[PDB]
Amino acid sequence: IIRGWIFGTTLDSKTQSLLIVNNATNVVIKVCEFQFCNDPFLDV
Amino acid sequence: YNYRYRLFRKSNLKPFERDISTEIYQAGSKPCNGVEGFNCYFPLQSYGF
Ligand SMILES: *[C@@H]1O[C@H](CO)[C@@H](O[C@@H]2O[C@H](CO)[C@@H](O)[C@H](O)[C@H]2NC(C)=O)[C@H](O)[C@H]1NC(C)=O
Ligand SMILES: *[C@@H]1O[C@H](CO)[C@@H](O)[C@H](O)[C@H]1NC(C)=O
């Protein structure tokens, strides 16, 4: 059920954030000023 | 007039740190609430080449 992590300061597009999404051992990684789902999850 | 520097900061950068924040704040420490004015100098400033 655990499928990654968010890292940064404010975590809400006010700053650059490292996003890691995990598919057990495959990983997706990107570093934008993302706006996620505001109460975060992988959006299945 | 485009070529730009943050003229002031609230701390020095870590080596190879990138910072694209854009907020007015201050040069110094006067209460300013994100509005320009005395001491409230926006650090993003540029050169007339
Ligand atoms: C990295 O980010 C942190 C915030 O998450 C910055 O820490 C704050 O720095 C100001 C002064 O610049 C202090 O007034 C705050 O009390 C600090 N907060 C915390 C929680 O420590 C920090 O300046 C940033 N580091 C760099 C090198 O830019
Ligand atoms: C991992 O999951 C993402 C969606 O969360 C998907 O785009 C990607 O193709 C997946 N990769 C693998 C190898 O499972």
Curated annotation (Swiss-Prot), chain A:
Q: State what changing residue 3 to I does.
A: In strain: A23.1
| Residues carrying a glycan | 23
**Function per UniProt:** Attaches the virion to the cell membrane by interacting with host receptor, initiating the infection. The major receptor is host ACE2. When S2/S2' has been cleaved, binding to the receptor triggers direct fusion at the cell membrane. When S2/S2' has not been cleaved, binding to the receptor results in internalization of the virus by endocytosis using host TFRC and GRM2 and leading to fusion of the virion membrane with the host endosomal membrane. Alternatively, may use NRP1/NRP2 and integrin as entry receptors.
Q: How does it assemble?
A: Binds to host ACE2. RBD also interacts with the N-linked glycan on 'Asn-90' of ACE2. Cleavage of S generates a polybasic C-terminal sequence on S1 that binds to host Neuropilin-1 (NRP1) and Neuropilin-2 (NRP2) receptors. Interacts with host integrin alpha-5/beta-1 (ITGA5:ITGB1) and with ACE2 in complex with integrin alpha-5/beta-1 (ITGA5:ITGB1). May interact via cytoplasmic c-terminus with M protein. May interact (via N-terminus) with host bilirubin and biliverdin, thereby preventing antibody binding to the SARS-CoV-2 spike NTD via an allosteric mechanism.
Identify this protein by name.
Spike protein S1
**Provenance organism:** Severe acute respiratory syndrome coronavirus 2 (2019-nCoV)
